[PDB]
Scaffold this active site. Structure first.
Site, PDB file in Angstrom:
ATOM      1  N   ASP A  37      39.085  40.964  32.010  1.00 57.00           N
ATOM      2  CA  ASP A  37      39.413  41.322  33.387  1.00 57.00           C
ATOM      3  C   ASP A  37      40.819  41.896  33.515  1.00 57.00           C
ATOM      4  O   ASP A  37      41.804  41.165  33.380  1.00 57.00           O
ATOM      5  CB  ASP A  37      39.279  40.064  34.250  1.00 57.00           C
ATOM      6  CG  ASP A  37      39.247  40.360  35.742  1.00 57.00           C
ATOM      7  OD1 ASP A  37      39.387  41.529  36.154  1.00 57.00           O
ATOM      8  OD2 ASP A  37      39.074  39.404  36.522  1.00 57.00           O
ATOM      9  N   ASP A  80      34.794  39.153  46.687  1.00 57.28           N
ATOM     10  CA  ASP A  80      35.788  39.089  45.646  1.00 57.28           C
ATOM     11  C   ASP A  80      37.130  39.306  46.354  1.00 57.28           C
ATOM     12  O   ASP A  80      37.357  40.351  46.977  1.00 57.28           O
ATOM     13  CB  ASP A  80      35.542  40.182  44.617  1.00 57.28           C
ATOM     14  CG  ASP A  80      36.736  40.421  43.709  1.00 57.28           C
ATOM     15  OD1 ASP A  80      37.515  39.492  43.397  1.00 57.28           O
ATOM     16  OD2 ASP A  80      36.889  41.566  43.280  1.00 57.28           O
ATOM     17  N   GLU A 118      35.685  33.648  38.894  1.00 56.99           N
ATOM     18  CA  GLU A 118      35.459  35.084  38.771  1.00 56.99           C
ATOM     19  C   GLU A 118      34.687  35.479  37.497  1.00 56.99           C
ATOM     20  O   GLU A 118      33.759  36.283  37.571  1.00 56.99           O
ATOM     21  CB  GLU A 118      36.784  35.837  38.896  1.00 56.99           C
ATOM     22  CG  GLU A 118      37.405  35.701  40.282  1.00 56.99           C
ATOM     23  CD  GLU A 118      38.865  36.122  40.353  1.00 56.99           C
ATOM     24  OE1 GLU A 118      39.457  36.500  39.324  1.00 56.99           O
ATOM     25  OE2 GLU A 118      39.439  36.063  41.453  1.00 56.99           O
TER      26      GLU A 118
HETATM   27  N1  LIG Z   1      39.427  55.218  37.531  1.00 57.23           N
HETATM   28  C1  LIG Z   1      40.343  54.296  37.360  1.00 57.23           C
HETATM   29  N2  LIG Z   1      41.138  54.328  36.271  1.00 57.23           N
HETATM   30  C2  LIG Z   1      42.107  53.449  36.130  1.00 57.23           C
HETATM   31  N3  LIG Z   1      42.438  52.472  36.970  1.00 57.23           N
HETATM   32  C3  LIG Z   1      41.605  52.473  38.065  1.00 57.23           C
HETATM   33  C4  LIG Z   1      40.572  53.315  38.323  1.00 57.23           C
HETATM   34  N4  LIG Z   1      39.960  52.980  39.537  1.00 57.23           N
HETATM   35  C5  LIG Z   1      40.654  51.950  39.957  1.00 57.23           C
HETATM   36  N5  LIG Z   1      41.664  51.603  39.109  1.00 57.23           N
HETATM   37  C6  LIG Z   1      42.741  50.607  39.184  1.00 57.23           C
HETATM   38  O1  LIG Z   1      42.234  49.280  39.200  1.00 57.23           O
HETATM   39  C7  LIG Z   1      43.184  48.493  39.963  1.00 57.23           C
HETATM   40  C8  LIG Z   1      42.282  47.812  40.983  1.00 57.23           C
HETATM   41  O2  LIG Z   1      41.616  46.795  40.294  1.00 57.23           O
HETATM   42  P1  LIG Z   1      40.642  45.807  40.962  1.00 57.23           P
HETATM   43  O3  LIG Z   1      39.848  45.156  39.909  1.00 57.23           O
HETATM   44  O4  LIG Z   1      39.980  46.512  42.070  1.00 57.23           O
HETATM   45  O5  LIG Z   1      41.700  44.746  41.423  1.00 57.23           O
HETATM   46  P2  LIG Z   1      41.746  43.184  41.750  1.00 57.23           P
HETATM   47  O6  LIG Z   1      40.457  42.481  41.881  1.00 57.23           O
HETATM   48  O7  LIG Z   1      42.677  43.190  42.901  1.00 57.23           O
HETATM   49  N6  LIG Z   1      42.523  42.578  40.511  1.00 57.23           N
HETATM   50  P3  LIG Z   1      43.853  41.784  40.294  1.00 57.23           P
HETATM   51  O8  LIG Z   1      44.814  42.740  40.921  1.00 57.23           O
HETATM   52  O9  LIG Z   1      44.030  41.681  38.843  1.00 57.23           O
HETATM   53  O10 LIG Z   1      43.579  40.502  40.955  1.00 57.23           O
HETATM   54  C9  LIG Z   1      44.336  49.421  40.489  1.00 57.23           C
HETATM   55  O11 LIG Z   1      45.422  49.288  39.539  1.00 57.23           O
HETATM   56  C10 LIG Z   1      43.641  50.796  40.455  1.00 57.23           C
HETATM   57  O12 LIG Z   1      44.549  51.873  40.182  1.00 57.23           O
HETATM   58 CA   LIG Z   2      40.449  39.016  38.957  1.00 55.56          CA
END
Ligand SMILES: Nc1ncnc2c1ncn2[C@@H]1O[C@H](COP(=O)(O)OP(=O)(O)NP(=O)(O)O)[C@@H](O)[C@H]1O
Ligand SMILES: [Ca+2]
Length: 378
Positions: free
Chosen positions: A196, A7, A172
């Site tokens: 998402d 991912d 995704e």
């Molecule tokens: N316990 C939690 N509570 C709230 N937010 C959290 C927690 N754990 C992780 N995150 C948040 O989730 C985010 C990470 O999301 P994630 O899905 O891993 O990102 P991604 O795939 O990069 N998504 P995107 O950025 O939309 O492409 C960050 O803003 C973190 O602060």
């Molecule tokens: Ca995504």
């Protein structure tokens, strides 16, 4: 060599592998199950992942991120033009193609968005290899459902230059469904809603699955709403509090603000499990140590309008897909931000008490599904 599932997120990336009927989300060198999509260049080295993100406070111009927003686009792309006005790193034009410009070892260099992503892809690859104890070649990489042919081409290219045999690029939301097994042939049509909410983007997808075949009926969301926006609200809150308690506006000091934000993002995660967390920062401004805390109640209050508005894109998705609340069979949570209690409450109330699919960590769900898909494709 097992094929892995990857991912590639805007803020965090995750890699999983299917072994013996079970899917394992591989933890990195620092023990995290997801690693930031950050690359940093210094006088002596090229830093990738946590190491890069852990130093951004003192190298804002040479620490690159948000490459997913650049990938497969043109410099003239209005999106690119708008976004670039907010990144602390250089973005140049090269024959109409956007390029990131940084200073590495005294020398000035530039990279194509796909080269930056390949760096993150390489880190994931070595994380898997370190775990598996064998070289990883074949892989399935995920991409948003709204990515066009160019964006998909670029993601594929980023993979090949990382030495990965990209078996396939799947959406995704589809990956999220497969993780839950929502692709099993049950002799009927099934509508699924993928909610998402990651680090920087919010996507709502409505899939229709008939005989294992997916049909994205609709999509909606906001490319500029994610966990980072929640952190911002906390930062502004604390800046005001520091100013209130010490009559010193720290807004100008970029190091103070960046360190505060890191403390907030951490507190935020804790708030998803506890009712309050503490912010303990030694000498934030001058020699003043910032010791304080926040309650989940106050946190929810800071982002009330943001959380609530998250429902607008959901209604739009139904409307377009031509479905009513009652017609969607399954709802799966994706993205690290979906761990927030108030957001889970908000969605259920909207779907009149309907149960949410969330047994698999939301930030690992996409990787999880890709891994399974990689296994079947191998
Ligand atoms: N316990 C939690 N509570 C709230 N937010 C959290 C927690 N754990 C992780 N995150 C948040 O989730 C985010 C990470 O999301 P994630 O899905 O891993 O990102 P991604 O795939 O990069 N998504 P995107 O950025 O939309 O492409 C960050 O803003 C973190 O602060
Ligand atoms: Ca995504």
């Amino acid at each position: 060599g097992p094929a892995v599932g990857i991912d590639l997120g805007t803020t965090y990336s995750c890699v999983g592998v299917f072994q013996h009927g079970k899917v394992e989300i591989i933890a990195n060198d620092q023990g995290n199950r997801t690693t930031p999509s950050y690359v940093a260049f210094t006088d002596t080295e090229r830093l990738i992942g946590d190491a890069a993100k852990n130093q951004v406070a003192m190298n804002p111009t040479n620490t690159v991120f948000d490459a997913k927003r650049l990938i497969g686009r043109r410099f003239d792309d209005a999106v690119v033009q708008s976004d670039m006005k907010h990144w602390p790193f250089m973005v140049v034009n090269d024959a109409g193609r956007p390029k990131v410009q940084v200073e590495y070892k005294g020398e000035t260099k530039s990279f194509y968005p796909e080269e930056v992503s390949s760096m993150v892809l390489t880190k994931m690859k070595e994380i898997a290899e370190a775990y598996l104890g064998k070289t990883v070649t074949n892989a399935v990489v995920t991409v948003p459902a709204y990515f066009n042919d160019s964006q998909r081409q670029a993601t594929k290219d980023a993979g090949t230059i990382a030495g990965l045999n990209v078996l396939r690029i799947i959406n995704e939301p589809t990956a999220a469904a497969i993780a839950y097994g929502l692709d099993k042939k049950v002799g009927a049509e099934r509508n699924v809603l993928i909610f998402d909410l990651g680090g920087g983007t919010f996507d709502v997808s409505i899939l229709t699955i008939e005989d294992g075949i997916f049909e994205v009926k609709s999509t909606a969301g906001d490319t500029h709403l994610g966990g980072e926006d929640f952190d911002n609200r906390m930062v502004n809150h604390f800046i005001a509090e520091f100013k209130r308690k010490h009559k010193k506006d720290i807004s100008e000091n970029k190091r103070a603000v960046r360190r505060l934000r890191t403390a907030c993002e951490r507190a935020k995660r804790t708030l998803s499990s506890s009712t309050q967390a503490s912010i303990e920062i030694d000498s934030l401004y001058e020699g003043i140590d910032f010791y304080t805390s926040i309650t989940r109640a106050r946190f929810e209050e800071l982002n009330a309008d943001l959380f609530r508005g998250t429902l607008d894109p959901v209604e739009k998705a139904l409307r377009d897909a031509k479905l009513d609340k009652s017609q969607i069979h399954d709802i799966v949570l994706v993205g690290g931000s979906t761990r927030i209690p108030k957001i889970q409450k908000l969605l259920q109330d909207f779907f009149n008490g309907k149960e949410l699919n969330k047994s698999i960590n939301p930030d690992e769900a996409v990787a999880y599904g890709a891994a399974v898909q990689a296994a079947i494709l191998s």
